[PDB]
Design a binder for this molecule. Sequence first.
Ligand code: ZN
Lengths: 109, 221, 534
Amino acid sequence: VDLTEPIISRFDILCVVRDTVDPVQDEMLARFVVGSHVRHHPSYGVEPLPQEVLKKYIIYAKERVHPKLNQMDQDKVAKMYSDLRKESMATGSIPITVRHIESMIRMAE
Amino acid sequence: IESIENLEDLKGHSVREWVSMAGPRLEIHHRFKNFLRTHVDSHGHNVFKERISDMCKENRESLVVNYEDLAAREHVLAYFLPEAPAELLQIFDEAALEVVLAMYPKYDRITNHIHVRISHLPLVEELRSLRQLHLNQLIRTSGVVTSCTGVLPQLSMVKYNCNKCNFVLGPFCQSQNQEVKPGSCPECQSAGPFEVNMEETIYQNYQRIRIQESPGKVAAG
Amino acid sequence: MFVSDFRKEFYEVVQSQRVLLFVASDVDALCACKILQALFQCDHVQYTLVPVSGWQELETAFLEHKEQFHYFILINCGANVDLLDILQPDEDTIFFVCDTHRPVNVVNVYNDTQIKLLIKQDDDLEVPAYEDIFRTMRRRQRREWEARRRDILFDYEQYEYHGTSSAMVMFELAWMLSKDLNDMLWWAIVGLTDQWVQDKITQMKYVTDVGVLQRHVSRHNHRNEDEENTLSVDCTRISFEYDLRLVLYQHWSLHDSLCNTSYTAARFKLWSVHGQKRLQEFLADMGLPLKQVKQKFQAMDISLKENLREMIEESANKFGMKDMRVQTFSIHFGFKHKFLASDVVFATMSLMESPEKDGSGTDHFIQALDSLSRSNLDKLYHGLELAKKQLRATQQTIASCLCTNLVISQGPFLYCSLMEGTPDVMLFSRPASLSLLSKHLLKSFVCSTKNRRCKLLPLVMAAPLSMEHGTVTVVGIPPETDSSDRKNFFGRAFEKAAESTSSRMLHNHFDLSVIELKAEDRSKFLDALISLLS
Ligand SMILES: [Zn+2]
């Protein structure tokens, strides 16, 4: 990556996107892309919301709703964090610090 | 004042004086009151009952009217609105206050004036394209706010203590054009160093912004 | 046996003696204790006062003190159990019992030598006759009589409820002695208002008792005062008020009062996200600016306040809250001290049931008892702050329960449970606060749900109590209909379930409808309760 630990640890969600060859997925992706170019001309399974409805839903969810945590089964997450720290120390792939715990709480909320 | 069955026949006047005189003024007042009371959306829901109720729930003193709805429901008001915007907006504010105090009789404790705001006006203009033809007309523009003053108090209806006697000069309206000079005291004719009566003067919030063309709508260089 | 005349057969007896007061932990008990303390201090009666929070500590205190005292007074405890069997006294002690709990135990009623009940005979009392309860074809009829006894005595002992306030009883004693000070009348008012706030009595009985207290208030207000001769501002003035049902609304903002009052919170459904707009519609209908409504009431503009009560009633009537007013009382003294009886009730109650871990429950009793005297106004104001915190915690807990749908209809009764470690559960672990929480939550649930069936059910609530011994506190509440007579069967239903399952039920609180239960046995206990109520 060439980034360092203080900035890497500040990102809660850390995604890797690869462009490896896979012919069936390539065929489906090509069909989706060409279909998109057809659909948007000037003229997973589950279906999405319209984007207007999504924007209204987002602002309502952000401003009119406030989650509150009652319990989260502390043993599960504590053991997870402990051995995630062990494997991170083993491989050196990503620093885990203490921020990943609070990332868990944030993602649940 | 008899009801005027056709506002549209100006009979040689221009829109400004035509709506400034009493007959067409009362006709516009009644038409806007009826529009607010009876306008319904595509589902039949009375939209302005809901909007005024939300405004009075939240103590917001301002009522946004959709120009598309006004043009669809009451044509001549949409006709006169961009031609004489100050006059018709004053009349609309009066009518909106009447409707608001019909719905909520005690709202005078929260406000003394309802500002009718207009949205979705089709008269869109680019800042680079404004001409003398648009003067004293309701325009709609777009841009990026590049400067803002602090919210400053501005005189709106100002009263002055007389420089010698205890009399107070009558309410003078501030114009945005020039400083209001009091003149002379009608009790004694003195015209010396008059001073504002802060306690009896009515102020209004003022903020001067500078907008410019958005950087993606201006040409490069 | 019932004491016919409190002056002759109780007060003039204990006036010559050393006396031991056992006082229960509730505001009515505290007020009766204050009145009786004032009388004893007038007459130099060398009394000793012991707080008792339950049956076992009452037994412990009696075991400690039975050698040294021959006359005992039990305030808001003892009347609803067999005190002779519970305490095992010596043959020549005397137990005076001033207690609101009903029905009175038949052994207490028909014991003619040792138990003396300071209970008004004109209360809601229907005692079975002595021959129906106490002592071939002859033995066949004996067994038939015993069966009839079991039937009649179950019909008597089924429904538990509350009678006239002990503070009012002690004030009537003070009036008969003609040593009734204005602060004693205020303590009587606070006891009755404790009964009303905790919903231990019907609205009819509360209005009747208010009608009784109005005449005493008028007498005290004309002892040295009329329309042209008036006292110092130092002196206390008690006034009858047709005031608002909002809680503590003269000590915080009207917004907080509307949000944290049980009635308006339940009606506007403020636990829900949508309910705040209903409340804003109500305030806009009134025409109160939201800034003024959110400002503290003492700092609110005075032009909004001098018709606020009738404005509230007028808007509430067209919003469907037909009874926002309540007949109550207020006390003034000095320039700035003003309290409603509900305010003093909530402050003293919070000082008793405080969430503070420092000290002990008896220390919190002591704080509450001190706060009822005007030499401890700082304690009273501290109690008011604690009451604001308690009301806010109550609304947060109600919101959590309703939003998470912890209230589930278990056929005969609704059921709810607090969970260990969740917010404010330690505040509500104490049985009195838990009873108030369950009542408020039942009103909120009845206003929330749209099902006609659910609006008529009673409610059972559980909460954690112990981890060193692993137990829970369980309370039973009757239905929240306006037709309700404020009687419930859960005190006997709990023990019938407990004996049917042989559950580890412990019965320490003075109300039978509150119990302690081992956390493992709650499953079979609830199964027996569904089977029993059917
Ligand atoms: Zn002059």
